[PDB]
TrEMBL record:
This is PslG. It comes from the Bacteria. InterPro entries: GH, Glycosyl_Hydrolase_39. GO terms for biological process: single-species biofilm formation. It comes from Pseudomonas aeruginosa (strain ATCC 15692 / DSM 22644 / CIP 104116 / JCM 14847 / LMG 12228 / 1C / PRS 101 / PAO1). GO terms for molecular function: hydrolase activity, hydrolyzing O-glycosyl compounds. The gene is pslG.
Length: 412
């Protein structure tokens, strides 16, 4: 089946597309270079992970110097930042004494956590938004079992405390892993909705990782229909906004751990296809995982999600995204695809207009092939993975080659 998408509203990349960042893993010199590369894309939103057991190493004993300096740097570079705090400090963890995962258990008292998020927000008034925990539907962030009621109480205490510091500042709920599914078969969004958590007015967000850009398996590319369903449900619950705070693929060589091996070229291809989908769905903002490759402190797979390598230099995905954003320009308005004949089965098709008024068609199909555009005499085809630019012309319609990877047709 062909999947045509039309976005609900205009997209301004600087407002819409941010990146995750692990700036505290790096020297200031190195993270400022990563920031140079982010600004060269015309982007400014970053999402930073903070781990409570690294910030408060004993009760009321903190390690804030490097975060203090980072916040000043982010403000000086004019980035907009969302910070999330996750994990329990050792003095407050519900972990049993013998657990090797002390910070992966929730706090014994949600108010203690809430006070720390208020202290951070007070200390760092430049931060644009504050996010409460991460992926509480996943065992690795909330042991020993997912607990909707416990997360709801943590989110409520945190939302109250953050709003006391700054009643106007957004409060972002935890990014839910996947589409919020839990091991017990419920979904965290459904369970929190039954608890009335929409009454807190926090931003909703999830991390819809799928093996391929458009779904998990070639015979079931249901990303778009699944995202549409979740997003309509969140809208229907009255959420203020929907973000996706984490999505992406690793270029790692293996061994395979959950994600199939796709390499640097697969990373570039997949990120561009997924971006083309998510920017045409009902998200207010999304954050690619992640700005930089990571060293051996990260898992083998987690080392290679970067736009940038360890030296803060572009990987193929960065160069491809850069070519894509140069073709689109800074702002796209929803539009319709050109009229086609014989578009291949399984194609994806998305139309936009750029700031110069020209049309951009984003399209691909697993089966490749060709498509006829009967009503055009001129258009330019751009392959963002290779940099190839092809002027196409015909007296009676164009023929356009279709690839498994994204291409961009620009036409009047
Ligand atoms: Cl941290
Ligand atoms: Cl896990
Ligand atoms: Cl047309
Ligand atoms: Na297909």
């Amino acid at each position: 089946e062909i999947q045509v998408l039309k976005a609900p509203r205009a997209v301004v990349w600087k407002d819409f597309l941010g990146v995750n960042a692990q700036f505290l893993w790096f020297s200031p010199e190195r993270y400022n270079k990563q920031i140079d590369r982010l600004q060269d894309l015309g982007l400014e939103w970053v999402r930073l992970d903070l781990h409570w057991d690294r910030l408060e190493t004993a009760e009321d004993q903190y390690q804030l110097a490097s975060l203090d300096q980072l916040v000043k740097d982010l403000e000086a570079r004019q980035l907009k930042s969302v910070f999330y705090l996750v994990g329990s400090a050792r003095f407050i963890t519900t972990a049993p004494f013998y657990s090797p995962f002390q910070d992966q258990y929730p706090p014994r008292d949600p108010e203690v956590f809430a006070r720390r998020m208020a202290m951070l927000s007070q200390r760092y008034p430049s931060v644009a938004a504050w996010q409460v925990w991460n992926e509480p539907n996943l065992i690795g962030f909330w042991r020993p079992k997912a607990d909707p009621e416990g997360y709801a109480k943590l989110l409520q205490a945190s939302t109250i405390a953050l709003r006391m510091v700054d009643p106007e500042k957004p409060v972002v709920s935890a990014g839910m892993a996947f589409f919020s599914e839990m091991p017990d078969g419920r979904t965290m969004f459904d369970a929190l909705g039954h608890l009335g958590v929409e009454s807190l007015g926090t931003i909703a967000t999830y991390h819809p990782y799928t093996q391929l850009p458009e779904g998990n398996y070639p015979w079931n590319l249901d990303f778009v229909s699944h995202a549409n369903q979740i997003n309509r449900a969140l809208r229907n619950a009255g959420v203020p906004a929907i973000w996706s705070t984490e999505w992406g693929w690793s270029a790692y060589k293996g061994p395979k751990e959950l994600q199939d091996i796709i390499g640097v070229e697969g990373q570039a291809d997949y990120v561009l296809r997924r971006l083309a989908l998510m920017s045409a769905l009902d998200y207010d903002r999304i954050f690619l995982f992640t700005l930089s490759d990571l060293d051996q402190r990260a898992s083998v797979r987690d080392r290679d999600y970067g736009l940038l390598d360890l030296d803060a230099n572009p990987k193929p995905v960065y160069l491809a995204l850069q070519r894509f954003l140069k073709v689109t320009g800074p702002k796209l308005r929803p539009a319709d695809p050109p009229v086609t004949e014989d578009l291949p089965d399984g194609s994806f098709s998305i139309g936009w207009t750029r700031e110069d008024g020209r049309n951009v068609w984003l399209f691909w199909s697993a089966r490749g092939g060709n498509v006829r555009l009967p009503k055009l005499k001129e258009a330019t085809l751009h392959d963002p993975l290779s940099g190839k630019v092809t002027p196409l012309s015909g007296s009676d319609g164009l023929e356009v080659p279709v690839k498994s990877s994204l291409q961009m047709l620009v036409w009047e």
